[PDB]
């Protein structure tokens, strides 16, 4: 109870809210700019200095940040059906409806997230 005052007197914990987009998007321009700007050197430097070598097996730089094209992601995860009009039977129709609903929701969620950030 004593340590709950750090977290606004909240006894018990929730699980961490799980990011819908798990990397920065392409539309987040400022982040991209920050990433691509010249990395500093000297006292508060990041990488390796130009003259200095790096260990044989290891990479010199850090790996590049995979920026999500959101439209591309949507297309891949949630492809619209190519065979557009093939639909008979009740169970099949139900499945199709379910699929459509899932497409709608995940599309909306991603787009909203992109806008929201």
């Amino acid at each position: 109870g004593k340590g709950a005052a750090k977290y606004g007197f909240k006894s018990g914990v929730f699980p961490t809210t799980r990011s819908i987009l798990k990397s920065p998007t392409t539309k987040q321009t400022d982040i991209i700019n920050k990433v691509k700007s010249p990395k500093p050197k000297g006292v508060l430097g990041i990488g390796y200095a130009k003259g200095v070598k790096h260990p044989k097996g290891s990479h010199r730089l850090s790996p590049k940040v995979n920026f999500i094209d959101v439209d591309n992601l949507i297309a891949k995860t949630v492809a619209e059906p190519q065979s557009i009009k093939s639909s008979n039977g009740s169970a099949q129709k139900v499945r199709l409806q379910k699929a459509e609903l899932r497409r709608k929701f995940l599309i909306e969620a991603f787009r909203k997230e992109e806008a929201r950030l």
């Binding site: 699980p15 799980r18 609903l101 929701f105 969620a109």
Partner: protein
């Protein structure tokens, strides 16, 4: 139900007086263990109406505070709801008639609406 990720009710509260915690969880992890994401609550015991209110003809309500957008997202990524959860979602208006099983399947009195 099927799946790895599943939207279900975790039980909370005391004996003879349940409240439910709508979560998304792993199928393997326990019923009341800490889940992936809590989406909402659900008290099954309906709000008790007054005698006058009953005479008039006003129905009790079951309160279900719920993150709609999150739930939708979870449905989209393919987290199968439980038999009770899916019914609740249908009642709310997230899920369609598509999810309604043969047992569930009667004239409607009051229609759904969003309010503020």
């Amino acid at each position: 139900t099927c799946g790895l990720v599943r939207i279900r009710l975790a039980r909370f509260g005391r004996k003879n007086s349940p409240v439910y915690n709508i979560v998304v969880a792993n199928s393997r992890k326990a019923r009341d263990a800490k889940p992936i994401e809590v989406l909402g609550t659900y008290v099954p015991v309906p709000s008790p109406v007054t005698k006058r209110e009953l005479k008039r003809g006003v129905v009790p309500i079951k309160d279900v505070k719920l993150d709609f957008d999150r739930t939708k997202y979870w449905i989209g990524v393919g987290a199968q709801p439980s038999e009770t959860v899916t019914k609740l979602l249908r009642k709310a208006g997230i899920l369609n008639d598509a999810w309604a099983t043969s047992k569930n399947s009667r004239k409607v009195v009051f229609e759904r609406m969003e309010t503020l």
